[PDB]
Structure 1
Amino acid sequence: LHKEPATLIKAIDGDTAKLMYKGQPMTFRLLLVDTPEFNEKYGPEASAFTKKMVENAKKIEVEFDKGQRTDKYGRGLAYKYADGKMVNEALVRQGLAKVAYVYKGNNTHEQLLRKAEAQAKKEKLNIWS
């Protein structure tokens, strides 16, 4: 997999944001995770976590997996990096997302994320508290 450039247009919630990619605006949905909705418990905390990470980054990058690059809603499906740190992983490590939506052929980072989830759960963080 390869990292590609994008710029933040606006934060949306814990697992989506509007980015400019190849010069076009797109909503991106993080691969392999599920954050609570803003109206759910830990929703506002997930939204704030991703917002800070993406708004504070000097450099945002998107990394597509080997399979589908857009979902049925026209959202980009990617691993997102903020100054080299993967947002998807960071959310899971903090207990603010669960590993989820692991479709075959788009699951390169599954084991990395499951290890983070196991650590979050061991620490009883947030969703696991």
Structure 2
Amino acid sequence: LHKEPATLIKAIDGDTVKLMYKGQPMTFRLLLVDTPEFNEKYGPEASAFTKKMTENAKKIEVEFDKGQRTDKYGRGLAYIYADGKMTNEALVRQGLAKVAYVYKGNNTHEQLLRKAEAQAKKEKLNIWS
């Protein structure tokens, strides 16, 4: 997998962000995770976490996996990095997302994320509390 440049356009909620990628605006859905809807418990905290993480980054990168790069809604499917730290993994580590939507072929970082979820769950963090 390879990191590609992109710039924040707008952080949308816990697991979707609008980015400019190859000069075009596009909404990205973070691979392998599910954050609560803004309306649900921990939804505003997940949104706020992704917003700070992405808004504070000097450098945003997108990393596509091996399979599908867009979903059925035209959203990009990627791992998103903020100054070298993976937002997908960070949300899970904090108990603000669950590992979810693991489809074969787009699951390179599954193990890493499950490992983070185990630690979040052990700590009874946020969603696990």
TM-score bucket of the superposed structures, by smaller chain: over 0.9
| 1:15 positional shift | 0.1
Q: For 1:121 and 1:17, how far apart are their aligned partners in 2?
A: 25
SS at match of 1:25: strand
| 1:70 positional shift | 0.2
| 1:14 positional shift | 0.2
Match of 1:106 in 2: 106
Q: What TM-score does the superposition give when structure 2 sets the normalisation length?
A: 1.00
| 1:108 positional shift | 0.1
Please list the CA deviations of residues 33-88 of structure 1 after superposition, one character each: whole Å capped at 9, or x if unmatched: 00000000000000000000000000000000000000000000000000000000
Corresponding pairs, count: 129
SS at match of 1:62: strand
SS at match of 2:20: strand
| 1:23 positional shift | 0.1
Q: What TM-score does the superposition give when structure 1 sets the normalisation length?
A: 1.00
SS at match of 1:121: helix
Q: For 1:43 and 1:26, how far apart are their aligned partners in 2?
A: 22
SS at match of 2:17: strand
| 1:107 positional shift | 0.2
SS at match of 1:102: coil
| 1:27 positional shift | 0.2
Gaps of 5+ in 1: none
| 1:106 positional shift | 0.3
